[PDB]
Amino acid sequence: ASSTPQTNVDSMGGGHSYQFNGQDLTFEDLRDIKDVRDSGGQVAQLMDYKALLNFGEGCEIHVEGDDETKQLVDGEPMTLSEWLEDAFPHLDLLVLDLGGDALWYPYAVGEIQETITGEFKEALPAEPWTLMPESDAQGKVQAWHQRTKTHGGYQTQTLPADDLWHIVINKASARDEVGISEVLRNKDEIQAFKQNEAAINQAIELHGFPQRHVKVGKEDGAPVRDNDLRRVRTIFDPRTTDANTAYFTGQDVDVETLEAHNFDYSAIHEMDMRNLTTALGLPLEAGNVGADGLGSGKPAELRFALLKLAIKANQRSFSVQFVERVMRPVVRDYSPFDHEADIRLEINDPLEDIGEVADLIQQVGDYMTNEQVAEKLDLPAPEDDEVADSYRSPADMEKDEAGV
Amino acid sequence: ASSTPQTNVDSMGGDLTFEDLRDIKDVRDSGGQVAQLMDYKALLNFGEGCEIHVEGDDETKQLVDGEPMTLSEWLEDAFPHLDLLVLDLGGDALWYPYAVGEIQETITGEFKEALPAEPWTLMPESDAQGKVQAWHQRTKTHGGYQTQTLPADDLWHIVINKASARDEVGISEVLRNKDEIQAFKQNEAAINQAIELHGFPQRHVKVGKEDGAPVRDNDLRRVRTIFDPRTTDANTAYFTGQDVDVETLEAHNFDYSAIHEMDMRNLTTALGLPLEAGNVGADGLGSGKPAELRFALLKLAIKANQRSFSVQFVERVMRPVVRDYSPFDHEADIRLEINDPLEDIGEVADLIQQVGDYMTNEQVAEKLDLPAPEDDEVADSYRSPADMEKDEAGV
Amino acid sequence: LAIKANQRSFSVQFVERVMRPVVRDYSPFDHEADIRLEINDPLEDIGEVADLIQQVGDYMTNEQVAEKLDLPAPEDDEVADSYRSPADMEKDEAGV
Amino acid sequence: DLIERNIQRVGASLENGINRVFLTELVDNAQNNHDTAGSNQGYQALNSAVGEVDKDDFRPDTYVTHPDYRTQLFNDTNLAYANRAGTNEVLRNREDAPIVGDIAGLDMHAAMSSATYDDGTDIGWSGGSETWGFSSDGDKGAVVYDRDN
Amino acid sequence: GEVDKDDFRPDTYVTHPDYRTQLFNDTNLAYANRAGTNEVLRNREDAPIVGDIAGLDMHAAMSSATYDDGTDIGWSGGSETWGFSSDGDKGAVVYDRDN
Ligand SMILES: [Mg+2]
Ligand SMILES: [Mg+2]
Ligand SMILES: [Mg+2]
């Protein structure tokens, strides 16, 4: 074969921030994403729920055969997992922030940061709406261009690709290093939602309530002028009328009503929320909206499976990039361990029922090691390797040993 | 018999254009309802991940680099992130007629990865036998396009959807269902416009007496200013002479819910998904044998696609990689399995309780999705490892 | 019933018109052998089969059970051909 | 492949069209002007043009240039003499010299063709108000400008 | 510049002995500070600047006798005068080597 790509890509000749929509990803597009994110209301809450589903349940670090890695780091032993757990103490928060940003924006992006003594401090995120990648003719990122608001104007700078890192959840193709923002992708659906919300709110103000219409004068009789109506306005004034006000009139005053003109805004709300949730790939239920038949049985089983698959796909996509582009460099450059080790960062499933796991452990524990049970049950494995590796429960081994 | 086919193949490559390929790209990237359904299709078929097996894998044990590996262990190092690759290629092969890509090497000439290419940029060129001989690529570039031809000898490609068992070029589901996709989008657009016009009441103030003095545009500007809805508070009241009528254009009812449900029933069925995938329910179908049928039909369709993908990935990607960059036998019985997306572990647990007495511990571990036991005798035996441990301790 | 009828119609012809000629012309084996190709039931419920095995397993050889349960039969002919479960024979062997 | 050839021609022809629409707006509707009056036409003109834009409190960063202007600029002793320029890059590599894209505070040179400006001679096109060139009294031979405006 | 005005990019030049002689007397090449090296002053045709000047990648020094003046038997003669001595002589060609 060959050591370099020989199929081309759709890049704009290189230099540009070329993206899915056959054009250039501008800082204006980036701040439009920031405006959808920061402006609150229902669209903001839904994409926050999306982030919480994908990344809110926290994380776990595994290394294959890590017991073999035992090494003195500072006159005392660690394994690579133990070193990584000290390197990234608050990884649950970092995963939630980066994973959120990589769903909102085309990428999450950041730096590696060091202590003054030059050992590793942290992986430090950077504000994704401020940073824009530059692709070459084969699509790979060569530089990061940044602009930022400062004291009434903007600073601007270029940084090399060589010492930032970035993560892309959503891609145009498996070769796309720039990625695609779901906020830009669904911009029209987001605007359609916001406009129909505004239209309903305005329609409720105009039509949702009855309004009093007083008509004055006999039909084909004497005309009434504005200055005459101004006095009648005082009598039937809605500001100062009360619940049990009665009226006395001659025959030539009619108290009519503009009825509340019935329209099914609830159905329009449901349809808007249905359009928005499906466009953002959330289930309908995330929008505080429900539907018949879909709440139970195999219809429910399917949509919950579809949601869980979508979550697992995002989680694996993130995990691989974070290990390959953040953790392995940090191991290589600041650790006494081998960076080629089989590291996995795994992100927890948000929709596990531990009751169902406990039912499984009840039914088939006879076929699982105590370590495997502890892993499923989300507990530390037993401290003694023979009991961890054995199949029958540690309580059964204790009661039998006590029987000796 | 013969060593070349003697029946003909109803075609020559000298079916579809780069514009058809870019139409698929435009349907894919534009998002909304259609894109989400075809993404759900990709997630069901390929989202649950994969596993590599080799029959007789234990016998393959060989020193690769100062350490033993089996062929399965080597393959799992050759393809570390195969779950992601399977979802990417499997997704592309549902959208486009094919997924397509390169084999790549390190600078040292050892295997790096199978690299997918952008499938809308590439079309196959085929012989009179119907086999692909070259690939023609067109890509956007500064001031126009780049164009090139590549020999079929160092690319690979995978086809899920076929005209026939002989079809090496495949069918796009999007291009096949182009009519239903456009019918869906037209009706969705029609509803959206009709809701704005007819979903909301509108105020119609009529001024002047019938058969009375006429009222003119300059006069209506003064009236408009009084009744302007932009200025109007919810509990505004009106006072008028007899010759002003505050009429309403009512919200004229139409069943846009039933039209959405019809559109979704057409589209989901055309894309082979059950209606439930489109967030739409139906009467009676959510229970009993009616449910069991449609879920069996979905699972069968998934198995067919998975089995079709598995074979071509092993035959066109893995075996060449083993042959060219590995010390193992490329004719070994490699299998790639892709997991069942809808498997209920609780039902498997019930089965293991009911008939575990007839299953080897390795068959139980395999069904339960766990590593087989460390001791071959406990793996091969039928009664539980826990039951063998308590006996070993007791005796 | 429609499925079973189509499956048998296909199976018989595929064995007779494809597999037997291939065995006859390219294989060292007897092409007159009782080859069968079975196609699986798409609507089979393994939970119903599990109930059946619990209810009447006492009348089925371990191979008949393994066949119904869609597993490889035991790699030991005495346990395969016997009626009581392989786990029950293993615990009795361990009872020696 | 003649369809490949023709897709290339059609793309090139449309791009040349964008190029003409751009250059004709750029040359005709610039509000400032440095008149060299046939003298000091190299770096000093380029600096003086930056000076005109600076006097209106904008900051230019780009220049677009006619082939005759380029020819004059690379004869300028301030660029041609390695001594005066600080490198021999202009003497050696002409327009490909890194100095040519980094002069008078400008950070891009957009070298343009002679034929691009709309002289009104091509059918369908109706000419701009200026003459693109650097040959004769009143020719506009370069534009110094802010890329973002 | 004359080639650039027809929208081609030249990369090579072919030169007469008189044109070479005159070119190496050019103050911009002769003075080491003006050239950025003393290579021309020291090494004449062999100086790397001579092959890397005015955007050209290559110098191809030609002989006086090589051009067909029509004086040799069997050769009919070209239209120009190859020289750099007198009004109208062609003393160099600057061109694209691939064209
Ligand atoms: Mg009157
Ligand atoms: Mg009248
Ligand atoms: Mg001015």
Ligand SMILES: [Mg+2]
């Ligand atoms: Mg050079």
Ligand SMILES: [Mg+2]
């Ligand atoms: Mg010319």
Ligand SMILES: [Mg+2]
């Ligand atoms: Mg010398």
